[PDB]
Structures are given as C-alpha cells and as structure tokens.
Amino acid sequence: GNVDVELIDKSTNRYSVWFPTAGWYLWSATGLGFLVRDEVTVTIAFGSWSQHLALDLQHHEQWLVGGPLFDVTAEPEEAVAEIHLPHFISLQAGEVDVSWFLVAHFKNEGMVLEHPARVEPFYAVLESPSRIASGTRLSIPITSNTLIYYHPHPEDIKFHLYLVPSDALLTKAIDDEEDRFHGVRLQTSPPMEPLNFGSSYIVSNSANLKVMPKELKLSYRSPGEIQHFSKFYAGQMKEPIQLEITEKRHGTLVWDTEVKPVDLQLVAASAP
C-alpha cells in the first residue's frame, strides 16, 4: 500500500522512507519501484540535471535526457534488488532503440553509464546497485535530438482575480516532482488543479505548438514550444484572460510544421 515519508530538509527535499519487508513496492509519487528483499531504510532526494552533467550534454543534440534525478541511498547486497526508475520518453518500435537508453550514476568518479536490461513503457530497470545520486536516465540517439517523440501533459489553472479569471496552461513532460514543485512555484498565484490529461497523441522536441480555444477571447502567446528544464525554473506557460464567469472552454494544441493536431481539451468553470 501507500508508504510514509519523513522530511529531513525541505531545501534539498530529502525523504526518509521505511520499508518493512520484501515486495514490489511501487511508489507513484515520484515513480520508484523499489523491488526489495528485506527491511530497508531508504533515503531519496531530488537532484537537478544542471549541476551533475558535464555541461556539454544538455546542448549535445545526440544526447537527450530522460527522467528526473534522485539521490537514492539504501542498503546494498540484494537488500534492494531492482530499481524501476521513472523516465518519460515513449516506446514504439520505429526511431527508438532499446540500446539507445542509458542509465547514469553520479559518483565522485563522475558519470557511470550502464545499459538497462529491459525498458518498460513508463520505467527503466537498474539491477543490483552496490550509491548516491543514482536515480538517473540518459539517451544516445544515433540520429538528432528532434525526433525522439514523447509529448508533454497539459496542466491548467483558472484563478479568480479582480473578478476576472486568469488562465495558466503548462506543457511540460511528466516528471512528478517537477510537476509538483512547478505547482509549488505557481502557488504565488494560488492554483486549483483539476484532473484533465493530454496524453492522447505524441509530439517530439523542438516542437512549435499553437494554442487556441475554438471561441476567441484575449489570446496571449499562441505559438508555444516544447522544452524541458531543471527542477526549479519557469517553463513556457500560456496566460490568457477569460474576463467573465462563463462556463465552457475548449483548448486545442496543434502543430505548425504539419497540419495534424495533438490535443483537444474541454474544461468547465464549475469549480473556479
């Protein structure tokens, strides 16, 4: 079932988690499947990709990053047998190879890149770790960075201010701590988060998506783009104005380099 957390330091976001015995033990609040064999006192933190790379591989466009970074330390020697580590990049047969996936490890050595054995549609596996900053995901595409094809999920906020709803459209890839602390950064314009998901189709990186509701209001910043950044940042949001207490809103995310769309969402103002 659900497992508890102990917050040691909020600045570095460090969690102490108790593990009773053997089991699968998926924890979906970050996406860690800690396939364990005994009682494990595990420590997990949040890592930023900016400070751990060689500073050349963010801008190397044969070197796509996947997943978020974790500082996972646990008991070694088959106490934690398998790591099912959360990444985001999609799994179809064309233009994605299993061999292109890599799992890093950030020691005082530097980076240790090992291949994973199997690749799950949401997770990637690390086998028998021997350990800090271990939750890692890299990729070497033999072709360019712009064709590796996994889609963000939209995340929308309608907030009531001077009796006028300001909207907030966010199009970032699915990283749970990134999404959550993006909302915590968004707490300064205090948000309410309904449950609507734009996981219908796929889109690559370097993608210019235009946004439109089908009915037209004060439209701001239509040709947005698809990019990924650190844990603490500001992504390319959209901030239109509703100006009224109307109920119905239909947003649409559609490409520019080709005619096809990627997302059509229906949202009401029943809970502003």
């Binding site: 050349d56 190397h60 466009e61 044969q62 050595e109 530097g110 980076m111 890149l113 090992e114 291949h115």
Partner: protein
C-alpha cells in the same frame, strides 16, 4: 555545354549570408571546445583508495570561456559494459586566467602566434612530478599550486598562489628546476631569471639585455628563441634546465646549471610592422631575417648558480665554450633543438647549416664551458684548467640532397654500463626517405684537444664513429616527430611508443616497438580514426584524443593491460572516457576522402565536400581549397568540422569543394615532399589541376568553366599560381595572405625549400607571383586578395608588392584587409566577415 545543366548558386543577400555564417556557428559553441591536452598522469599509491591515478590537463568544460587547469580521477576498477565519462574537476578556484578583452603583453601575444594558440587562458603549463608542482602563467603573472607530493590529493579546488616579483615586465617561459622543485626560472625582458617558491627571492643570470630603447639599439637576448626559430623550428624555449644537481663540495653548496642560447641579432634586418593598437599609430621593429640576409649569430652558454641548504642563490656564474661557438662549430647557423641527458652528463644540441641540408647532433659536457670574464688571462687560465679529454662529441650527422626536417626525437639512455658508447633513439628521415626511429650507438673516444690555443676544426673533426645503427621501423611511412609529436620510452620494458602512418598516411596511430630487438610494430589505437596520444609516466595507460572524417573528436582513456612477461602485446583496453564525439550537425555532411594517381604514377590524396541536396545532372561550381605547402597535410582521416567548417558551409550552399594534397605535403616521405625543391609553386599547382581533372572525371558535378582556387598563406600563393599559369582552368582566385615574393620571406622556411637567392635565382623569379602579374587576367573581377594587416609572418608587404605590380601591369583586383588580425583571423566577428566575403565573392562573380 548546356546552360540549363549548370547549377547556379542561390544569390543570397549580404545579411542573408551573415545569417548563414552565424547559423553555421550556432552549434560551434559546443563542437569547438579545445579538447583536453598536455596530460600528466600521477599515481596515488594507497592500495585502499578508489582511484588509480589523477589525470591533469588543460581544458574548457564551458563552465568558463577560458582554457584552465583541471583534473580527472582515474579509478582502480571500472564496471563492464559501462561507458564511464569523467567529471572535469577544476584544479583552481574558478578565477580569471585571462586579461581584460582577451589582450596580452607583447611577448605573450607574439608567442601565441608562433604556437597558433587561438584559445584564451592557461595555454601552456609546467609540472614537476614528485613535488606535484604546477607552475603556470595567468593573466599577467606567475602562479603555482601543488597536488599530492608531500601534500595530499584534495577534493575541493584551492586558489593558486601568486608569485610576486620585483621585476617589471612579463615573466616569459617558466620552467621548474627538476633537481630542486623549490627553484624555477623564467625569461624577463629577454634575459634569463631564476626564482624560488617558498622564499620568494629572485636572481638574474644573464645580463646581455638592458631595456634601453627599441631592438635596433639593444640587440642581445638570452634564453629566448628568435622569430625564425620559433617560426621555423617549432622551438619556443631557449633555455633548458640541467635535470640533476651537482655538488661542488666547497662547503655545502648545491650547483644548478641551465643551458641557454645567447643570440646576437645585430646584423639582422629590422622591419617595421604595425601594432595592434592602431590608434597610437606606431609600428614595432622585428628582427626578421630575409633570405640572402644574415641570420642571427648564435651561441650556447652555461648558466650556473649554487644554493645553501636553506635554499638561497648565494653565487651565480655565466660560462661559455672554451673556443668561440662560430669557430668550434663552423658552418653551423641554427640551433634546431637542445637539452640535456637525464643524468646530466652531457648537454645535447641539434645544429643545422644555412641550406639546411646538413644536420648534426652534438653533446656539450658542462666542463667544456669555461667561465666568461673580460680578462684574456683569466680566460687562458681556465682554458688551461679545462680537462684535455673533455670535448664536444658529434654523435650523429644527417646529410641530405634536398633538406633536413627538424625532428625533436633524441632520447638518450643511461650510460652507467661502461661509461662511454652513447645510446640514443634518433629519428632519421634523410636516410631512407621516411622518418623512422633508430637506435644509434656512437663512440665517445677523446682525441685530446689543447683548448687554450685556438684551432680550426676540420670537416669531420668531432664526428664520432657509430658502433651500430639498428632501424626500429622501416617502410613507406613515417614516424611522427614534428608538430609536437613525441616518443615515450619505457626503459623498464625496453619499449618505445611512437606515432606513425603505417596503416595509411591519413591516420596518425600510436604504435609500440621494442628498441633492443625491433621486429614487430604493434598498433595500440583503433583503426578508422586518427589519434593524438599521450602515454603515462609509468606506462600503464594512455590517453588518445581521436577523430575521423565523419565523427567529431572524442578523448578516450585506454589502459595497457595483460601479462607482464610480454609487454609489447599488452592489450589496450578502453578504461574510461574524457570527451565524447560532439554533435555532427544535420547541415554538416562529412566529406569523403579519396586518392588517385598522377601521370608520373605517384599517389595523391584528396578530399571533397559534396553539394548539399545534390541533383544528378547539374554541374556545380567548384572551389578548390588548397594549402599545398609543406608541414601541412589537409587530407587526413580526422575531423574537419572544427577548423574547416566554412568549406562545409560552401558545400551547403552548393559548391563542390575539392582539396588536393599534391607533391610537397607532409607525412608522405622526403622524396614526395622534395618535389618542390628549386621549383616551389610550380609542381603543386600542377598536382592541384590534375586533382581537379580527376574529380571532374570521377564525379559528374564539376563545372570546369566555374572553378575557384582559394587558400590562406601558402595556398593564396598557389591560388595566384593557379590564376597565373592556369587561367583557362581557374575562373576566380581567393588568395588569403599570399606570399608574393619569396625574396621577402624569411630564411628558415624559404631557404630550406628554394635555396639561398644568389644560388637559385631562376626559380625565385619563376615562383614569385608578384613578378608574373603580366600573366594575370586582363578581364576584371577574377581575383580577390585577402590579407591580415598586422601579419608578422606573411607581411603586408607581400600583398602590397602584389597590388603594386598589378597597378604597374594594369591588372585589376579586389582586396580586403583585416586591420586587427595577425595571420589567422582570430576575432569571431572578423572571421564571420571573412566567410561572408568569400560567399559573396563566389555567389556573385564565380
């Protein structure tokens, strides 16, 4: 000739062309990286720590814009199936190692033009192993730090200690004393100084320079390599520490020698070249030796000093050879290289003749240098005092009919087994035609010289007889010795690691051989790439910074591993990686290397960049890029995207780009290079034309009506030879920095290849393009001359005399100046202008 079957390049606007060149360099912030170099492996010796070595090197991780000292941690055991890539930890505490706006002093800026240093920051550093001392030059000053000697191996970076001085001026060329790491030495205002780390005390050793006025009135320098040496003998140092310390045994005093080169450039022609500060409107004098004109008058000298146990330079002493240098070594014009044997017994020096057809290696034992004082009776006194047996030993004497190539490979062995019969590893290209290693044993038997009386040496005076001269390598390929290549000699396993072109001339590979018994040459590097390698001091692992034409350059660390009883076949296994292959961009199509044969049936290599989005049928216009001169091989299997990205930009606009390494290119043997001897400029262009004609026959997109020839330095000179003797072949000619009169170029280069000008005058005139302007085309807009105004190497006079003779013959030209650029266009804005000018000129007028 169908005019609808000839590809017309899209006429871009100038701002469009700027947008294109900038878009060519929008990924150059990553790929142009200054990949790490100048490695120093250090052991840790714990048997309980994790790391086997610490690798020290220069590098830019692009956390800073400057080249700085860094280190890596080499582990004791890596995981299998793992590409481990090392973090580049910083040696220093993230300071600024460059002056404001990238400027330098006059001595610092002139050094980087000789070394072709386009990178800012710590470009050269010195290291002393067991003390762990790092002596380097930063913004305008000397700095130091230490890592794992008597101190430990730190994990955080510390700030480097400043070395303060009472001296006014830059402190050029620092070297740590190997025998005593507390002491070091540098050049200050063309005089040799020496200092100490802990106490801070300095001491001048030579007093030939005084800082009066310009170089026309204070002509004596010491411990420096002059222009032509730095320029033509890739030597940028003129002093060499003695690696061991002698003990005079007076009371406790520890002597420390330095060999230095005194140079009298009084009789050398002075030329004025404009200064970079154009507003101030002065020039700088340069002792630039023309061909025909006199070279500097050189001499070697020994500078000693002594030290207490506390580390203070109590005494000092200049010493000079017991006879004059010019008289002891007649017909010797140039000191190519020099140094010391490891034990300190002899100071070696490579001498050279003015035609440079006559090389000879000499050993100068420190007792051969008597003191120097003005009184001729004290001079006679110590001339009597020098032992009769002590002499200079000419160990090796290379003589050739074309020219000597300077190979820095000497390597002496210890002599403690029967203390004569010197054994060394000497490279000799003149013997078989190809640069090959040899083990040579010469016989140092004293003939007995009355050193007080002055005598004239004969033609074979100090020449030692050779016991044996085993050839460690042989074939139609060369061992890399020039251009900062070197050999690494493990004397424990009796192996010598060298670089060579055995597999193909297009690929520099690391080879190893046994020097005691050389039968089998074992390659250590992977084929399909060209490699710049560097071995460890304990010879258990090396680095290779390698690339091929397709892949961008990577830097992998290999580890020799295997049975110890057979070290020759020790298997290099990839241990860890430093730098990876950069992004090969989608607008960058990597070129294809080819070869072909001449009508004289000699194999020439060439490159071609394909026109992007090539359509079969269309005859594209072709830019024959060319250098063509010696010491440069354009065509090789290594990444061209760094330095020759512009050629791909032309290709991406639709130009065929052809590159031909005709006769006279390096790394193909002396007989191949020697086809330009006495007719420099006349055979290279013929090879380039034939290379064009081959590419025209092989590939179906070469428009012979639209051919551009283009190149910098020597190539622009060839571009002008192309437009002079091949007007129906070449439509236009973009000549960058051309050498238009060989009578104006300096001795070291020009005399080596053509002759002294009164000996050969017919070929100077024939291959001086400025004297053949009458043959340049009368119709306009075919000739674009590019020149950097501040060029001390190929002076603006060359372009000026060309433009002069074009005016006098009534011939048109276009011309472009780079007022702030010396020889290679270093400012990115200025390079962007250069390329947009090249694209515009071809777009409109080819």
């Amino acid at each position: 000739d169908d005019p609808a079957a000839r590809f017309q390049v899209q006429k871009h606007s100038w701002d469009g062309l700027r947008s294109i060149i900038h878009g060519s360099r929008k990924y150059s912030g990553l790929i142009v990286n200054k990949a790490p170099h100048d490695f120093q492996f250090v052991q840790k010796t714990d048997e309980s720590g994790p790391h086997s070595h610490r690798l020290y090197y220069l590098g830019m991780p692009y956390g800073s814009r400057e080249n700085s000292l860094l280190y890596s941690e080499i582990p004791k055991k890596v995981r299998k199936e793992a590409l481990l890539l090392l973090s580049w930890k910083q040696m220093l505490d993230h300071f600024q190692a460059t002056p404001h706006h990238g400027v330098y002093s006059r001595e610092e800026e002139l050094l980087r033009e000789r070394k072709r240093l386009g990178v800012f920051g710590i470009t050269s550093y010195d290291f002393h192993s067991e003390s762990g001392l790092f002596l380097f030059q930063a913004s305008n000053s000397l700095f130091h730090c230490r890592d794992g000697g008597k101190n430990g191996f730190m994990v955080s970076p510390m700030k480097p200690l400043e070395i303060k001085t009472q001296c006014s001026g830059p402190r050029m060329d620092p070297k740590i004393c190997p025998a005593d790491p507390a002491f070091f030495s540098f050049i200050n205002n063309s005089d040799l100084w020496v200092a100490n780390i802990e106490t801070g005390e300095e001491r001048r050793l030579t007093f030939c320079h005084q800082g009066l006025s310009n170089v026309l009135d204070d002509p004596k320098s010491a411990g420096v390599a002059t222009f032509v040496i730095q320029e033509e003998f890739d030597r940028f140092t003129g002093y060499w520490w003695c690696p061991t310390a002698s003990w005079e045994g007076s009371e406790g005093l520890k002597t420390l020698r330095i060999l230095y080169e005194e140079v009298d450039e009084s009789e050398v022609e002075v030329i004025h070249v404009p200064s970079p500060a154009l507003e101030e409107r002065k020039t700088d004098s340069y002792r630039y030796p023309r061909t025909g004109s006199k070279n500097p008058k050189i001499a070697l000298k020994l500078a000693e000093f002594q030290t207490d146990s506390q580390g203070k330079i109590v005494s000092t002493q200049e010493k000079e050879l017991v006879q004059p240098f010019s008289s002891l070594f007649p017909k010797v014009e140039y000191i190519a290289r020099a140094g010391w044997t490891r034990d300190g017994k002899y100071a070696w020096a490579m001498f050279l003749d003015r035609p440079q057809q006559w090389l000879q290696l000499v050993l100068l034992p420190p007792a051969l240098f008597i003191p120097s004082t003005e009184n001729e009776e004290q001079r006679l006194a110590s001339a009597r005092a020098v032992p009769r047996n002590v002499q200079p030993y000419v160990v090796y004497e290379e003589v050739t009919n074309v020219w000597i190539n300077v190979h820095d490979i000497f390597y002496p062995f210890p002599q403690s087994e029967g203390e004569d019969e010197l054994c060394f590893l000497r490279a000799n290209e003149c013997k078989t035609g190809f640069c090959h290693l040899y083990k040579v044993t010469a016989v140092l038997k004293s003939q007995g010289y009355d050193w007080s009386e002055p005598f004239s040496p004969g033609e074979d005076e100090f020449k030692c007889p050779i016991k044996e001269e085993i050839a460690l390598t042989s074939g139609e390929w060369e061992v890399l010795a020039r251009h900062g290549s070197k050999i690494w000699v493990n004397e424990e396993t009796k192996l010598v690691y060298f670089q060579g072109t055995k597999d193909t001339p297009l690929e520099h590979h690391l080879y190893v051989v046994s020097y005691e018994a050389a039968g089998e040459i074992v390659r250590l590097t992977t084929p399909g790439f060209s490699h710049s390698c560097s071995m460890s001091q304990n010879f258990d692992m090396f680095v290779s910074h390698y690339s091929s034409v397709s892949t961008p350059p990577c830097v992998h660390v290999y580890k020799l591993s295997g049975p110890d009883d057979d070290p020759l076949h020790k298997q290099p296994r990839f241990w860890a990686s430093m730098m990876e292959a950069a992004s090969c961009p989608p607008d960058y199509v990597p070129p294809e290397i080819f070869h072909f044969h001449t009508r004289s049936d000699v194999r020439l290599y060439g490159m071609i960049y394909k026109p992007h989005a090539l359509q079969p049928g269309k005859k594209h216009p072709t830019v024959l890029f060319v250098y063509g001169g010696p010491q440069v091989q354009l065509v090789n299997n290594s990444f061209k995207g760094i330095k020759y990205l512009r050629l791909n930009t032309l290709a991406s606009l639709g130009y065929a780009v052809v590159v031909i390494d005709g006769r006279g290119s390096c790394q193909r043997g002396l007989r191949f290079e020697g086809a330009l001897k006495n007719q420099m400029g006349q055979v290279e262009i013929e090879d380039q034309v034939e290379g064009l004609q081959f590419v025209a026959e092989k590939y179906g997109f070469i428009d012979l009506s639209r051919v551009a020839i283009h190149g910098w330095s020597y190539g622009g000179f060839l571009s002008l030879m192309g437009l002079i003797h091949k007007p129906q072949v070449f439509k236009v000619a973009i000549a960058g920095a051309p050498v238009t009169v060989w009578m104006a170029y300096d001795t070291g280069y020009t005399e080596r290849y053509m002759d002294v000008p009164e000996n050969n005058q017919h070929g100077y005139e024939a291959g001086s393009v400025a004297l053949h302007v009458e043959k340049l085309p009368n119709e306009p807009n075919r000739l674009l001359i590019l020149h950097g105004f501040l060029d001390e190497n190929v002076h603006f006079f060359h372009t000026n005399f060309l433009v002069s003779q074009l005016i006098r013959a009534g011939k048109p030209y276009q011309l472009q100046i780079y007022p702030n650029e010396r020889h290679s266009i270093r400012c990115p804005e200025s390079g962007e202008h250069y390329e947009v000018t090249l694209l515009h000129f071809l777009q409109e007028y080819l």
